[PDB]
Amino acid sequence: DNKLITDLSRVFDYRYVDENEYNFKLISDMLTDFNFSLEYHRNKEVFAHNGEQIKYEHLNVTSSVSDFLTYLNGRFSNMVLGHNGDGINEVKDARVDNTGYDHKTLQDRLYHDYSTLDAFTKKVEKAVDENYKEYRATEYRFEPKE
Amino acid sequence: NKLITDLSRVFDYRYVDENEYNFKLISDMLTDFNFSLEYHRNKEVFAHNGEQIKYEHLNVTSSVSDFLTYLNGRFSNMVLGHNGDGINEVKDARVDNTGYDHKTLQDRLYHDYSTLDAFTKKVEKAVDENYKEYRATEYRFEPKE
Amino acid sequence: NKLITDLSRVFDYRYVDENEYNFKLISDMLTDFNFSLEYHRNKEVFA
Amino acid sequence: DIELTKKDGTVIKLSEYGFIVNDIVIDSMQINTKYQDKENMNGRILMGSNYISRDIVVPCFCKVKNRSDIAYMRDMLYSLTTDIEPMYLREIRRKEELNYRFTQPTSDDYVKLDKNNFPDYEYSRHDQQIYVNGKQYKVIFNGVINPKQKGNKVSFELKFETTELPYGESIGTSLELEENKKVGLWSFDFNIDWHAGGDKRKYTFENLSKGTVYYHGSAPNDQFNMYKKITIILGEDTESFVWNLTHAEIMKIEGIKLKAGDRIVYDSFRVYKNGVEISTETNISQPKFKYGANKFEFNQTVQKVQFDLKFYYK
Amino acid sequence: DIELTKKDGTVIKLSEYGFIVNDIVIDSMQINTKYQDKENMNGRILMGSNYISRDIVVPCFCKVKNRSDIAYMRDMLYSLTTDIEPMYLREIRRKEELNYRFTQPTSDDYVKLDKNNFPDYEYSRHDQQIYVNGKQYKVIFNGVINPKQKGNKVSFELKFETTELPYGESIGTSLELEENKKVGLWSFDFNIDWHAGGDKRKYTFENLSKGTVYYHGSAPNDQFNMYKKITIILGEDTESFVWNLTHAEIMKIEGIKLKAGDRIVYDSFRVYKNGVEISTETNISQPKFKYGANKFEFNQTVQKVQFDLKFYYK
Amino acid sequence: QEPEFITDLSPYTNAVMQSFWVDPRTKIIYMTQARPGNHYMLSRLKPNGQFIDRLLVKNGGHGTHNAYRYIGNELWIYSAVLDANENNKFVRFQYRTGEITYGNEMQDVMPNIFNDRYTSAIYNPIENLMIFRREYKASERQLKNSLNFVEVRSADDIDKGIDKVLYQMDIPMEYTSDTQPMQGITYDAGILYWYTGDSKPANPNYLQGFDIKTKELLFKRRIDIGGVNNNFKGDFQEAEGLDMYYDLETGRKALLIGVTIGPGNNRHHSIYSIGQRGVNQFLKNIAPQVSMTD
Amino acid sequence: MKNSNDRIILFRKAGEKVDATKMLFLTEYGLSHEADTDTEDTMDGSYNTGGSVESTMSGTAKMFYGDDFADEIEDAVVDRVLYEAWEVESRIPGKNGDSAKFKAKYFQGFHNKFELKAEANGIDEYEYEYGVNGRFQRGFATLPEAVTKKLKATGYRFHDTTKEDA
Amino acid sequence: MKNSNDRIILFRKAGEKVDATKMLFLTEYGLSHEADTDTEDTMDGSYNTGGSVESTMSGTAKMFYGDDFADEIEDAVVDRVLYEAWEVESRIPGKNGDSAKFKAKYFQGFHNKFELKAEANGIDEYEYEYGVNGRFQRGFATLPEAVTKKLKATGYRFHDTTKEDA
Ligand SMILES: [Fe+3]
C-alpha cells in the first residue's frame, strides 16, 4: 500500500503531530494485516505448502514427504501377497504397533503396548502425587526447626 | 538494526532523526517479514519438520512422520515378516498380561482398554480435584468468612 | 494494537511519553511476530 | 523554497504568486573588526570585534503562459518585495526532493498540472513545504536585474540584507514556551526539553532569592534592541534593591523607596517603577543573557519574577 | 582535518558535529613594511618592518540524510564557529591517507558505516586523527557563503584571522616542560631534548650569578602580550639590583631598597615587588627571548630564579 | 510486577545513596555514598534504618557499588579505590568502623591483570560468581560506542589467581548515557538487571534487565517508586544501586531497588522490592519501624 | 536468456486522461543512466557527496501508415510537451495478489530529440531520444486491453482455396 | 595461457551484512587504471611529485529472467549507492595455510554508469561502468557456497528415452 512518511517536519506543529499520527495508523493496519495473514496461513489457508517444502527424517533417512508418499505408493503397488490362510496376512498386519517395530507375535505386541501404557500412566500418577505433596508442603510449611 | 525506544528529551535533530530512522526501520522490518513469510509459504524447502503437521482421521490425531513410518513398518512386516499358525496365535493372544485366559480376543482387548481408560479417568479426576483445591486455597474469596 | 492515535497536540512531555510507549508496543509486537514465525517454522507442533 | 515575508500589515509567500525559487543562501554575519597596530610590535591589539550584517541572497524565476504577462508578473514581484519597510523574512525548505509517483496508463490515474504548467508531484497533504525553523530575519531589499531567458521563463536575483541586528530573531516569546498555547514556532534547532513546567522551560518563578534560567539562544541577548523584558512583583518592602546576574553585570536600584506589592517592569535599559512614569536614574545597567545557565540572585525573596524574551542566533 | 576550537568555556571539534573538512591552509604573516624613499637617492630607507596577521582558510562541507536538515546543520555551524570571542584554534592532520582494508565476502566481515553515510576506514584505535602540533592560534571568524551542491552536500569557506599577535602560540607553559606532569602538548616541531632535568629543558635555577637559557621558539618573545613571566627569590640583600641579558636590553631596579628573602614577580613590562603593590617605576625595560641561547647575568647570586613563558612561532 | 515498599534508610550524612546491599545471614544494610572529593562513606545500618556505624574510605572514588562476599563467616568487601591519585585499584578488605585508605590494611586482588582501567564488582553467592563491571577509556570508546562492559568470572578462580573472562558483554551508550547513567547493576540466573535514572522527574528512570549469555535485551519496564504518580517530595527522584536478596533458607530471591528523593540539601533514601511470595514481608518484619514510643 | 521482443513500451501524454499507447515497430532500443559524481576530495582522503543523474532512453521505429503516433512524438519534441512513458516487461507478472500486472519502469520527461531518415525503395525509419525527469519509479503495471490484443499479433491464419475465402 | 572464464566477479552492497552475489552472463570486461601525473618541472630539471588515479571497471551482461541483480545495479546508478565488488580469480588458490581462498582484487565505489540495449529477436544486454574509490586492495578471498555451486554449472546430464525421464 502507501508507504510510511519517513521524512517529518522540522518544526513542532499540528502537521508534525498529524504526520506521526498517520504513520502510526498505517503501522497498526500493516501489523494487523500481517497477523491476520499469518493466522490464515497457520489455520485456514488450504494448499499452503506443496509437500516438497516439508522435511521427513527417520533412522538417518532424510527426504521430503511428497517424495516419500510416492515411494510408499510405489512399494504398495508392487507389494505381493499370498492367500496363506484364513487370516494369516491379517494377523501379520496387526503385529505392528503404530511405530513400526514389527513384533514376532500379536500377543507380544499387545503385551508391549499395555506395558508402555501402564508405565506411562503410572509415571503420570506418581508425578501427580509428588507434585501434590510438594504443593501441600510448600503451602502448609510449618517447620520451626528450620 | 533495532528500534530506539529511548527518545531524546530535548527535541533536537537527534530526536527527529531517531523518529525518522524508527519509521524507516519499521517499514523495512515489516516488508522483510512479509517477504519472509511468502518465501516460507511458496519456495522454502523443508519449511516444516514432518513431526509437526497433523493428520486427523476420525477421532484420531497424529503427525505425518509417525504415520508414514507406521505405513512403512506395515509394508515391511507384511513383506519380510515371518508368518504361520495364525489361529494358534489368536487363541494364545486371548490371554491377558496378568495370567488370566479370556474367552475371546475382542473381549480381552475390550477389558484391557477399559481398565486403562478407567485408571486414566481416575487419575484425571484426582488431578482436577487437586487443581480445584489449589485454586480455592490460592484465589480464595469468601466474604462469608 | 492499543496504540494512541490521539496524541497530545501540546508541546509537553506527555507527547514523547506516549510516542515512546507506542514504539515499545511496536518493538514488542514485531519481536513476538518474529518469534511466533520461527516457532511455527521449526519448533511448533501441529502447526 | 518559498521565501515567506511578513510585512507590517500582511503576510506573503512567493510560490503562492506563481514565483518558484531556485534556492535560498544566507551568508553569515559580516564581522567588522577594530584592530590597532602598535608601531614596532609584532602583534596588533584588538580594540573590538562586532557583528554587522547578514546578507541574504535568493534567486527566483517565474514562468507564465504568454510573453506579455511577464511584464505584469515582474511588476508584481517588485511591488511585492522591494520594500524599504523592514520586513520579517522566514525561510522555507522541503523535506525531500519529490518525484512523480507510480501511476497506471489505463485511461485513468492521469497526472495533474499546477496553475503554472508544471507536474504536481505534491499528491498528498504531507508533500508541500514547511517553515523549516521557528525564526525570522529583519530584512530589506537591494537592487535586482531581470534577465529574460527564453519563452516565458525569466530569472531574478534578490539580494536581501539585515536591517537592525545581524541575528536570527526567534519568533514567539519565551512565554509561549511557558504556556503551550501557540503551536508551531518551535523547531528542533532549539534544543528544548519536552518537560513543560520543568526546568529550562520556565521563566515564571515565585518566592525565591535566587534561581536558574536556561537561555536556549546561542547568540547573547545583551543588545537592548532585542525584546528582553522582565517584570517582577518585589515581594518584600525595601529602600534599596540590588540584583546580580551571571554573564552580565550587577544591577542596583538605590535612592528610591519601594514597596512589596509594587511591581517593576524592567525593560531593556529602562525601568517602569509601576508600569508608567519611568524611574530609570538608578544604576543604568542592562542585563545580558548569553546561553544556557543564566543564574540570577536577588536579595529579598521576590514573590514573583517572570520575564519574556526573544532568542537570537548566529 | 578537524579544526579544533577551544573557546572561553568549552572545546569543540567539527568532525564530531558531522562536519568533515577538505583541508586547512594557513597563510604566513602579513608583513607590513614601513619604508621611506629619499627624494633623489636610488634606495629607500627602512623605517620598520613588522608582522601583522596570519589569515587562516578552512573550507568545510557537510552531508546529511535529508534536504531539510541542511538548514539545521548550517545554523549549527554558524552558532558553533562565527565567534568574535577570541578563540584558540588547533590544527589537526592525519598520519596517512587511509583506505578500506581487506575483508572476506562470506556473509561476514562486512563493512561499517559512520553516523554519516560514509565508509569507516578507521578500523583500529590508532586510525583516527591527531593534534599534529602542540600549538594553537588566537583566532576570529570572517564572512562565509554556503553554496549547496546537489543532494545533501553543502560547502562552506571559513576565513579565520589572527586576533592579537600573528604567531603560533605554543600551548602549555615552559614549566610543564620542566615538570613532566602534563602529557601531550609537546610535538617534535620543537627540537626538545629528552634529558628532562638536563640543560635546555630547565627554567628553574638556584644560587647563580649567571646562567643559560634555551628558548626553543623560533619567533622572539619580545612582545609583552606573550605570557613571559619571571619570578626570582633574590638571595642577597641589596639597595640596587641590575640584571643583564642577551638578545635584549639591560635592566635595573634602582631607588628602592630590597631584602634577600623578598621575591620579585617580573611580569611583562611589570614588576611586583612582593607579589602585589607593583613598584614598576625603576627602568621600564622588558626582556626579550629570541631563540636558543639566551644567557642572563645577575649581579649578586640569586638564591632562586625560575620563569615560565610561552613559545611563539613564525 | 510492581515494587513494594520495605523501609527507609537513616544514614547520618547528607548525600545520595550511591548504592546499597543487605546481607542475608546477618540482616544488616551496607549503603555506599560518595562524599565531597574522591572519598566515600559506607554506613552499616539495621533493617529498619537505625544507624549502627560507618566507615570512610579516603580517596575511595565514588564507590558506585561494592561486592560483599561471605567466606565461612568472614565478610570480605570488594571495592574500587585509588591511592595517591595514581589509578584505580580493585581491592579486598574487612568492615571496620571509622576510617580506612589503601595500604597495609587493604590487599589488592591480581592487580597486574585489570588495574589498567576503572573496575568494580558485585557478588552472587548462589552461583558463587563475581561480576566485574569494567569501564572503557575514551579512545577505545570512540570505536566501541560504549562506556562499560561486564565480565562474569568465578570467585574460586579469583581466589586461586586463575583468570577467566567467560560471558563478557559490552553495554550500548543509550543504557549508560548522561540522561541514563548506570546507577545500578545486579546479576541473577543468567540475567543482568541494569537500573538507571536521570535524577530528574519526567525523565523516566527504570531498569533494562537483559541476558548475558546471548547478548540480547530481555525486557525494559518503567519505574515510578518515588511515591504518587508524577508527584514526588522535593523536585527529583534518582535511581540507585540494586540488590538481589537471597536467603540461606527458603531460597526465594527478591530484587531490592534504591531510590533517592527530595530537594537539594535534604535526601530520603528508600528501598523498594520486587519479591517472591514472602521475601519482602520477612525482610520488613525482621525488626519494626522506629517510633517515638513503644 | 531473455528475448527483447518480450519488453514492451507504453506512452501517454501527461495531462491526458486516457489509456496508454504502445509504440509499434521499434527496432533498436536503449536506456542509459549516466551519473555525475559530486565528489569532494580532502587533502588527506577522499569522499563522494552526491550524484546528478542524466538518465535517458533512445529508440528507433519504422513509420507504418496505420498509426499517427510518430507525429505526436514530433509535436512533443518541437512543442516541448511533457510525456510519461514506461517500459512494461511482458512475461514477468506480479507475485502476490497480482497476475495481470507486469513488471515496469515508469518515467516522465520531455522528448529532447527526434530525427527520421529514409532512402530509396526503403522503409522510412526514425530515432528518438527521450529525457527522464529525475529518478524513475518501478512498480508492477497493468496493461490496457488495446495493448493486450495487439500483443497477440497472429499472422494470416489458415484460409481456403477456390473462392472459399480471399 | 589463462582463459577469462576463470575470473569471477562478486558484488555486495556495503551496508548489507550478507554474502556476495556473483554476476552472471557477463560477456566483456575491462579494468582501467588511469593516472594523472602531478609533475612539477624545474627550469633546470624535472620531477614527478604525485599521482591522482582514476581507476574504474567496465562490464557487459545479458539480462536473464532468473536474477533481478541488474535492477539492483540500476537502482544504485540512479540512487548513488555505495557498492563493494571484487574480482576473485578462480584456479589460483592460497599458498600458505590457504586452500579455499582465491586470489582477488577488492574495491568499492559507486556505479557511475549503466546502460542497456536490445534489438529485434535479440537478447537484451547491458553495459555498466563502475568507479573505484581510491586504491584497491588485493588479498586472497574465499567464495560463498552459493557462488561455488554455481561455478560447477553442469549442463543437461544424461537422461533416458521412452518415458523414464523428461
Ligand atoms: Fe507454514
Residue numbers in the entry:
A (entry chain BG): 2 to 147
B (entry chain BH): 3 to 147
C (entry chain BI): 3 to 49
D (entry chain BD), E (entry chain BC): 1 to 314
F (entry chain BI): 148 to 441
G (entry chain EB), H (entry chain BB): 4 to 169
The authors write:
In a complete tail ring, one of these β-sheets forms a 24-stranded, highly negatively charged β-barrel—42 Å in diameter—lining the tail lumen, presumably providing a slippery tube for the DNA during infection. The Dit hexamer constitutes the hub of the baseplate, forming an adaptor between the sixfold symmetric tail and the threefold symmetric Tal protein, as well as the attachment point for the six RBP trimers. The Tal NTD (residues 1–331) consists of two tail tube domains (TT1 and TT2) that form a quasi-sixfold adapter to the Dit hexamer. This density matched the C-terminal residues 1135–1154 of TMP. RBP is a trimeric protein consisting of four domains: an N-terminal α-helical coiled-coil “stem” domain (residues 1–142) that is folded by 155° at a central hinge; a five-bladed β-propeller “platform” domain (residues 143–442) that was previously suggested to bind to the GlcNAc residues of WTA on the host cell surface; and two highly similar C-terminal “tower” domains (residues 443–636), each consisting of a bent β-sheet superposed by an α-helix. Six such trimers surround the baseplate core, making up the bulk of the observed peripheral structures.
The baseplate is a complex structure at the tip of bacteriophage tails that serves multiple roles, including host recognition and binding, cell wall penetration, and ejection of the phage DNA. We have determined the structure of the baseplate from bacteriophage 80α, a representative of phages involved in host pathogenicity and in the mobilization of MGEs in S. aureus. Phage 80α is a typical staphylococcal siphovirus with a 43.8 kbp genome and a 63 nm icosahedral capsid, attached to a 190 nm long flexuous tail that is capped by an ornate baseplate.
